[PDB]
Amino acid sequence: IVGNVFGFKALRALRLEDLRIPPAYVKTFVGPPHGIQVERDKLNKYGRGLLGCTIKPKLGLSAKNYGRAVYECLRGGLDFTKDDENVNSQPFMRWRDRFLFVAEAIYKAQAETGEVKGH
Amino acid sequence: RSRGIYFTQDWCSMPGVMPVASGGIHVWHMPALVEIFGDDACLQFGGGTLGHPWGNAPGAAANRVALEACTQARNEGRDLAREGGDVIRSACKWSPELAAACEVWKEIKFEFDTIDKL
Amino acid sequence: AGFKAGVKDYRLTYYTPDYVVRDTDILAAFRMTPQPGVPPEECGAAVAAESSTGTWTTVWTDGLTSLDRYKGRCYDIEPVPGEDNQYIAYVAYPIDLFEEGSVTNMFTSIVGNVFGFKALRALRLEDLRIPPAYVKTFVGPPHGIQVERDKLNKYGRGLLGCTIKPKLGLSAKNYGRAVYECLRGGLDFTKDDENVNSQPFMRWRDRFLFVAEAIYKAQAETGEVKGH
Amino acid sequence: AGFKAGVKDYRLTYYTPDYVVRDTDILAAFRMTPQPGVPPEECGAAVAAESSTGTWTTVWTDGLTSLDRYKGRCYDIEPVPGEDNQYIAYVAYPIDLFEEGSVTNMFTSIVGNVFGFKALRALRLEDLRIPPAYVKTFVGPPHGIQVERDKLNKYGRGLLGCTIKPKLGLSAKNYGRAVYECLRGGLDFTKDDENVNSQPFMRWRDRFLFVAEAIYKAQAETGEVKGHYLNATAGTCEEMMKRAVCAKELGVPIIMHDYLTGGFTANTSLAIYCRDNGLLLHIHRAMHAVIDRQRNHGIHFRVLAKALRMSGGDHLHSGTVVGKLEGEREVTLGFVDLMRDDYVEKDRSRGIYFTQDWCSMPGVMPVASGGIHVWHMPALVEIFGDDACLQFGGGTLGHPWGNAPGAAANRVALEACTQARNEGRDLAREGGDVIRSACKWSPELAAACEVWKEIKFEFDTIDKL
Amino acid sequence: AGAGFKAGVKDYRLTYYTPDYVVRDTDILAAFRMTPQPGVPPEECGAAVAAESSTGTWTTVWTDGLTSLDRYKGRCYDIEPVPGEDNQYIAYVAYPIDLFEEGSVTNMFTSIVGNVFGFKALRALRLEDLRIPPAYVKTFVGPPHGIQVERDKLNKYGRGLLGCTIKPKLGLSAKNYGRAVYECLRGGLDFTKDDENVNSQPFMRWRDRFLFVAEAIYKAQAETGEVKGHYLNATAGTCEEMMKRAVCAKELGVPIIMHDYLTGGFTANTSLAIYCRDNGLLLHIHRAMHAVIDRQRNHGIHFRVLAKALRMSGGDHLHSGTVVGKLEGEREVTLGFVDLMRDDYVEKDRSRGIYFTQDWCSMPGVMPVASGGIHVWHMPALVEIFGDDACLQFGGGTLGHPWGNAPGAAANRVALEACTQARNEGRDLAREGGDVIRSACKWSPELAAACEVWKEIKFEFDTIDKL
Amino acid sequence: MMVWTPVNNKMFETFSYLPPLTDEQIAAQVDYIVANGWIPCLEFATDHGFVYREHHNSPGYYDGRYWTMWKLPMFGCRDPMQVLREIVACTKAFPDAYVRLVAFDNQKQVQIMGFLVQRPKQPANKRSV
Amino acid sequence: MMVWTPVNNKMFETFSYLPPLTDEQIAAQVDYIVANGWIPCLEFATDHGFVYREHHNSPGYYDGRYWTMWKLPMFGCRDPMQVLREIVACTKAFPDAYVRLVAFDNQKQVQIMGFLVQRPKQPANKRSV
Ligand SMILES: O=C(O)[C@@](O)(COP(=O)(O)O)[C@H](O)[C@H](O)COP(=O)(O)O
Ligand SMILES: O=C(O)[C@@](O)(COP(=O)(O)O)[C@H](O)[C@H](O)COP(=O)(O)O
Ligand SMILES: O=C(O)[C@@](O)(COP(=O)(O)O)[C@H](O)[C@H](O)COP(=O)(O)O
Ligand SMILES: [Mg+2]
Numbered sequence A: 001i002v003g004n005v006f007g008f009k010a011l012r013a014l015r016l017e018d019l020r021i022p023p024a025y026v027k028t029f030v031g032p033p034h035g036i037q038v039e040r041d042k043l044n045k046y047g048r049g050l051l052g053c054t055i056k057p058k059l060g061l062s063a064k065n066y067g068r069a070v071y072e073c074l075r076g077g078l079d080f081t082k083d084d085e086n087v088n089s090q091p092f093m094r095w096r097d098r099f100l101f102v103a104e105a106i107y108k109a110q111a112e113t114g115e116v117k118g119h
Numbered sequence B: 001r002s003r004g005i006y007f008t009q010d011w012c013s014m015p016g017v018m019p020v021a022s023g024g025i026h027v028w029h030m031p032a033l034v035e036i037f038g039d040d041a042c043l044q045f046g047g048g049t050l051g052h053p054w055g056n057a058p059g060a061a062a063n064r065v066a067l068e069a070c071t072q073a074r075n076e077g078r079d080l081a082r083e084g085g086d087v088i089r090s091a092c093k094w095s096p097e098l099a100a101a102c103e104v105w106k107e108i109k110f111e112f113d114t115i116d117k118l
Numbered sequence C: 001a002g003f004k005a006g007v008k009d010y011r012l013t014y015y016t017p018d019y020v021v022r023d024t025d026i027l028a029a030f031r032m033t034p035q036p037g038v039p040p041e042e043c044g045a046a047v048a049a050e051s052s053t054g055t056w057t058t059v060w061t062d063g064l065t066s067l068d069r070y071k072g073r074c075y076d077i078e079p080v081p082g083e084d085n086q087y088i089a090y091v092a093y094p095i096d097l098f099e100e101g102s103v104t105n106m107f108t109s110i111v112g113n114v115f116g117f118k119a120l121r122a123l124r125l126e127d128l129r130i131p132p133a134y135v136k137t138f139v140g141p142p143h144g145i146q147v148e149r150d151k152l153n154k155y156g157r158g159l160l161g162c163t164i165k166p167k168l169g170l171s172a173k174n175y176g177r178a179v180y181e182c183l184r185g186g187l188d189f190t191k192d193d194e195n196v197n198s199q200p201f202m203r204w205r206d207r208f209l210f211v212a213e214a215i216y217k218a219q220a221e222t223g224e225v226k227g228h
Numbered sequence D: 001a002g003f004k005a006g007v008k009d010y011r012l013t014y015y016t017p018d019y020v021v022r023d024t025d026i027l028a029a030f031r032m033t034p035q036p037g038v039p040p041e042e043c044g045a046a047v048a049a050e051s052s053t054g055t056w057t058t059v060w061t062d063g064l065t066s067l068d069r070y071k072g073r074c075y076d077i078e079p080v081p082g083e084d085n086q087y088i089a090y091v092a093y094p095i096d097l098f099e100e101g102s103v104t105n106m107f108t109s110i111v112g113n114v115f116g117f118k119a120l121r122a123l124r125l126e127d128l129r130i131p132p133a134y135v136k137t138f139v140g141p142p143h144g145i146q147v148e149r150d151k152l153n154k155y156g157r158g159l160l161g162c163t164i165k166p167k168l169g170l171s172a173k174n175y176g177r178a179v180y181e182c183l184r185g186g187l188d189f190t191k192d193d194e195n196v197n198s199q200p201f202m203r204w205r206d207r208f209l210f211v212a213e214a215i216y217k218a219q220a221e222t223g224e225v226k227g228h229y230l231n232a233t234a235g236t237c238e239e240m241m242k243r244a245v246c247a248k249e250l251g252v253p254i255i256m257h258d259y260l261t262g263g264f265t266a267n268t269s270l271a272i273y274c275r276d277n278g279l280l281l282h283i284h285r286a287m288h289a290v291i292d293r294q295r296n297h298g299i300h301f302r303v304l305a306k307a308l309r310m311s312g313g314d315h316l317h318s319g320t321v322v323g324k325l326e327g328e329r330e331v332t333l334g335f336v337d338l339m340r341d342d343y344v345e346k347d348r349s350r351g352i353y354f355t356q357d358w359c360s361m362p363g364v365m366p367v368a369s370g371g372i373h374v375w376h377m378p379a380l381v382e383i384f385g386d387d388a389c390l391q392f393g394g395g396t397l398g399h400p401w402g403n404a405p406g407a408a409a410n411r412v413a414l415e416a417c418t419q420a421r422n423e424g425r426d427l428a429r430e431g432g433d434v435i436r437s438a439c440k441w442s443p444e445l446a447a448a449c450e451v452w453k454e455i456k457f458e459f460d461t462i463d464k465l
Numbered sequence E: 001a002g003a004g005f006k007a008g009v010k011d012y013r014l015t016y017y018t019p020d021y022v023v024r025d026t027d028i029l030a031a032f033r034m035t036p037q038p039g040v041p042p043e044e045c046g047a048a049v050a051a052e053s054s055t056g057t058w059t060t061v062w063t064d065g066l067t068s069l070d071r072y073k074g075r076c077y078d079i080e081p082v083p084g085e086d087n088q089y090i091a092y093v094a095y096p097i098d099l100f101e102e103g104s105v106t107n108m109f110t111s112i113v114g115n116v117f118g119f120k121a122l123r124a125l126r127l128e129d130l131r132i133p134p135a136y137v138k139t140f141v142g143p144p145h146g147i148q149v150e151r152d153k154l155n156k157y158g159r160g161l162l163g164c165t166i167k168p169k170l171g172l173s174a175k176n177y178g179r180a181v182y183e184c185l186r187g188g189l190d191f192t193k194d195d196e197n198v199n200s201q202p203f204m205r206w207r208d209r210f211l212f213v214a215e216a217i218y219k220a221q222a223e224t225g226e227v228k229g230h231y232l233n234a235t236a237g238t239c240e241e242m243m244k245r246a247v248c249a250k251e252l253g254v255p256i257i258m259h260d261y262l263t264g265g266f267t268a269n270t271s272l273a274i275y276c277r278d279n280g281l282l283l284h285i286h287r288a289m290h291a292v293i294d295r296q297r298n299h300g301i302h303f304r305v306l307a308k309a310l311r312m313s314g315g316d317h318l319h320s321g322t323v324v325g326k327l328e329g330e331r332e333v334t335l336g337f338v339d340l341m342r343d344d345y346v347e348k349d350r351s352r353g354i355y356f357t358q359d360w361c362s363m364p365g366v367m368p369v370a371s372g373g374i375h376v377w378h379m380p381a382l383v384e385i386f387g388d389d390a391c392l393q394f395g396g397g398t399l400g401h402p403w404g405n406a407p408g409a410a411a412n413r414v415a416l417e418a419c420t421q422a423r424n425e426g427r428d429l430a431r432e433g434g435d436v437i438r439s440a441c442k443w444s445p446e447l448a449a450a451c452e453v454w455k456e457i458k459f460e461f462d463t464i465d466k467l
Numbered sequence F, G: 001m002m003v004w005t006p007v008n009n010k011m012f013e014t015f016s017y018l019p020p021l022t023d024e025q026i027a028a029q030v031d032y033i034v035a036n037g038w039i040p041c042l043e044f045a046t047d048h049g050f051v052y053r054e055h056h057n058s059p060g061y062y063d064g065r066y067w068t069m070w071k072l073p074m075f076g077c078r079d080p081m082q083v084l085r086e087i088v089a090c091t092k093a094f095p096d097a098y099v100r101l102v103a104f105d106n107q108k109q110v111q112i113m114g115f116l117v118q119r120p121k122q123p124a125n126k127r128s129v
């Protein structure tokens, strides 16, 4: 649908505004791993919006400082924290170090508050 | 068409996706967010938490208080579009963490001409 | 200099017109169209900030690290000739910001969020300077031109190809039939159309097998290496 | 310019004294001793040629490629002060010559054949300039100093270690028994001796399990994180990996590897395994002095240290200066900066021939080990600062009261010295006084102080600048 | 009042100097050339080396009493002064077989050469020889094939093998590499090879090279009717990469690969030798870096020990030096370690540098490879030194021939075959070698061309690694 | 700057960061349930009132999410007084239990609200120091 | 020969093998932080004061490494008196907690010093018997 046509000389601009995906095509997809209802049921969280927060600065924090920040966020009342979109694995912070420290943080904040936490 | 939906869309029981509202929001936006999204949404406060004058735990509490106050108000039948300012102001008077966040960001708005118009 | 909560201009941290770029920096050239009343310098700084380390308000965690070492820097702003509201903003990014070997990570930083900022009306990334120190972290192309010519044993002219048509709708056997006829008449390559993957009218493995028969037949008939 | 068969001087192609080096070039500094009647320029050119593209006679295949692009180039030759027949030859290698991420390939080129040339009498590689563009192709250390301190939750002082002794001959159960007593008294780490691998008197897997029991018991008793560098060094890569995997299964924080006797190919493999599994990697430099002791021939340790940093390790033995093994102060201070720091300037008085930019590659923790005891503590803290591990084998297991008191003595000594330093005392001048005060106060330390009071290691240095 | 624990330093010689010890047939024996600091007694020095390479440290430890030091200690059992040196000694050290991990050269080196070379108390140390007893030898897989099996696989008998390194060392593309390899092999060479430092690089990626070299090997083989090979380099940054290369060589069906055992290392090498045994690949060993360790007379490890180690770790070929070429190697020394590489049983012989009788207990012999600055005029000397069981390599000597590789290869092959015939006919190559080559020049235009170009060329310099 | 206390400051999901709900406020939440046609239900816990992990450790597995149901969900009930009376009955029978009021939407098939009404025997302002 | 006691002889990293720090010794450590331009911070623990492993077991994973931060790290602070006053404020608010003074270096981005200043209510010489 959007492969080549946007580059045709004969048009000056093109914008795909909408698609009607018929049920017969929709059914061929695995789709979302859980979806809203199952998510609420897994986290045991109902009756309000969920609260999250991206750790900042976007880049530049060490793995240990990342978990430090995450624990303090989660213990104060947020349900989730998150890696910034561009935090992957970098010289200032390798991914597996981050995952381990964030895990420590999640579990500490969970035990302190009594509410399920994530990052 | 007034909401940009050109086609009737039937998802045939495919699970729904939770919308996430994130980017330059703070405690004063809470009523507008709860009004727009309802409960089935996640609201994200980066700067709005890590930029709180007392640190992350108080920042998080401020956001959580604000969201809970707004949710209560809505359930009690208050109109958040009209009364939202008042809900937050009341919560400020009550919670020192919230009050501190309210002061820091009171002036802050993001109002620009929309590019992606219908 | 302590932690002071609140919003301040991006240009106080992220506009640095006296910065001498380093040979390891990734450099971006953005064609930028600010909203009315937004100074180009504040716009360029916003772009640099929100594609590197900064967000909309001051965060205390900055002081745990060195912003100077990690921040993206808008280091130059040229106006565009014959445009009242267009600028080229040049942004330098330290090599530490990027994951080695990951184009995904580079795009995520440089073009991740900034294009959607309210404060700008339009934005276009025009060019990137990828420094050798970053380039060397990539596997890069599996072969490249020279090795490709050497494998195919083809030299001294352009290569000739052809997409099978119609784009969609041909059976696997007809695809091969078409492929053999093309290759045997002098083309080096034929190809699946971009959208030909695996579909009801033609499943991928059936197509691969018939195309293989076609490639080898045309190759034996002509004496020249063939592909699809 | 055609193909002309026959021999010609290397210097016609490979001596280029007007060459401007590129920021991506690998640079080598060779201390070179020519045979009589071989001009230094011809010698340098020969080293440059035979470590890059050239052989002993002209080959026609050169013209299929661009020799200018690929050749190593001897670009400078300095005579050495106070030597009639020694030169420093500087050679520049294009980054194209090297396999990305391979310390093995780098050594193969630069030190592969040239040391055996008839035309020279001796050759020593003194330093290498690894450009950032090459540095970035290496995975590098699995963790590095900062992440290590963060994992162990240890800050503000040097780390304390100890090798179990005797080197060989203890059973698995006795090994763990020794380890528990060491760790509970105040040491952070104990370790397998470099040659403890798997042997008839003690099989590796038995040792790993008893050592694990001992680590966890000492940790629960003291409340401090503890570790023991289990030796993964082995005869094959498969065996090496089996040992690393068992360490991981046991949940222990740190393993070790003898990088030069095991080899760079195995070492780099292990470092990558360690990064992927959160294991810290301690590096023992067994065999280095075979290569690096003599001033006229071999490879200086600073190059072997740079290579280890690229191949990967979290710790690396650095010498003690004051202990039973050789290492001169200024030389040691030079390579310790090369191991730990991000940017090190050229400084010939510390043996640094090139400015070295590590481009954010994690630093390696230096390990001071070998014939040291409590009286050396002030000198060690003065030389290394906090970012070091100090190891006391005999200095712990040789204490008259056993391992736990032995460990306590070393820990008290290190903490006393650290406190004194922080209070502004000058350890170089007041060190003896710091220890003497701590003796008066701690009976364990007093006993160690009495036993080793006389003991010094003062000999003429071989590896002089 | 039995021997208790007494804390403190005492002399190493009280425990580790035992001049009345009778060595056991299972002991590993080391011969160290030792240069003490002034005021350090040779006995104390020898004992220090024995102690610190086995069980002892600098001060007495209480844990000794939990085990039997008598059973485990290394022992300096003899000290000879060196003739015509005021401060040099040969110290002999005996090590119980219990000290070593079975089948691990890595472990053996770690103990014997691990720390002692850096001791303050000595000015210089050199490991000259090791006696590996049969009971330790049997714990090693050893070479994947060995000389006999290798000749049997290639179907090549009755002469030395001929090889050649592709040049320039670095800088040729995959396609050009194959082009050069085909031309060399079709002219008469049995083997070509990757240069030691040709691994995988921007100018030429390994897999591209392997495929083009495979095409070249098979083409030259079909053209000549003789089995051909090319030592594809498996040397790599990681074991996993090394194994990938070996596996691709196997998938290609090529007969032989190579490895730089010292810059790759013993652990990697032993793994590769096991792979080669299990998959029928021959394994050529390049000794890059050896001269960093083994050039100087006063300090390091003699190549004969590195050769013994390689035999145990595993290799079908091992570079041995040429004696007469551009790299150092004295004749008597080389003859000694060539025997140690190839033979089953080698007697003590100090005039060839062999300090110990060495019994290999049927472990396969390694083929010595003579390579480095040799050309057609060296042929008679090389055949005289090595005999048939050797591989002679001509890099510059082939790719530097005025007419190109195929003539180059033919010149080398004619020269070797002439020399071999002459030797078989009873001619003395040491005396008559020049005449054999001169006759062959008169007869073969390719040879003549090579003889003219390199007539003047000799490598004669003062030897550093003297006995 | 006030410090958010880590001692003993356990929370109970929705509304626990507000002042404790008055009787009038609880009644207002019940009216909300009824006005929306949702199904009210009560659940109680006599043991651990918090999520934990005893029996398994994998993602999205937690023990302690299920409490014990009080009677049955009150299907068809449109009377706020009846709901209020069940809260009293439940708390009466289990005066030492955690008790919570939840409501279900059978269209989305999910719990659509919930809050604690009783805990066993930090105050809203002693949460910072 | 004295025997190092295994009974209750828990340690707290840097300086715990010395006599307890006097007020003058603590002030000297504070001066050191200030002279070096490091960022002082306080952390406290009201529960387990030691490393343990509850939630996971792999290499380099431990629970109990993070303590609760007191307020925020004192960025820009060059005043030893200010630091000493925060120690008093923190120990006053949490008189039963483990409390430690730490300092950060933002160049290396790592904690560069740390020692315990308060534990909840072995003596330096009763460690051996
Ligand atoms: O990286 C950021 O800027 C954010 O983390 C928000 O940070 P703050 O909360 O501190 O502003 C989000 O990624 C953006 O909201 C993405 O935008 P969007 O959701 O529109 O795609
Ligand atoms: O084998 C030994 O002697 C040691 O265990 C120290 O024992 P002691 O503490 O009892 O002396 C070390 O492995 C060497 O110091 C290594 O040398 P280096 O650090 O020079 O590489
Ligand atoms: O790379 C080289 O220099 C060679 O290809 C020889 O080239 P030429 O045939 O052109 O001389 C060999 O690898 C060296 O001989 C190795 O030395 P050794 O055999 O002593 O280990
Ligand atoms: Mg983001």
Ligand SMILES: [Mg+2]
Residues within 6 Å of the ligand: C163, C193, C194, C195
């Ligand atoms: Mg197409």
Ligand SMILES: [Mg+2]
Residues within 6 Å of the ligand: D163, D192, D193, D194, D195
């Ligand atoms: Mg040791």
Ligand SMILES: [Mg+2]
Residues within 6 Å of the ligand: E165, E194, E195, E196
């Ligand atoms: Mg070579």
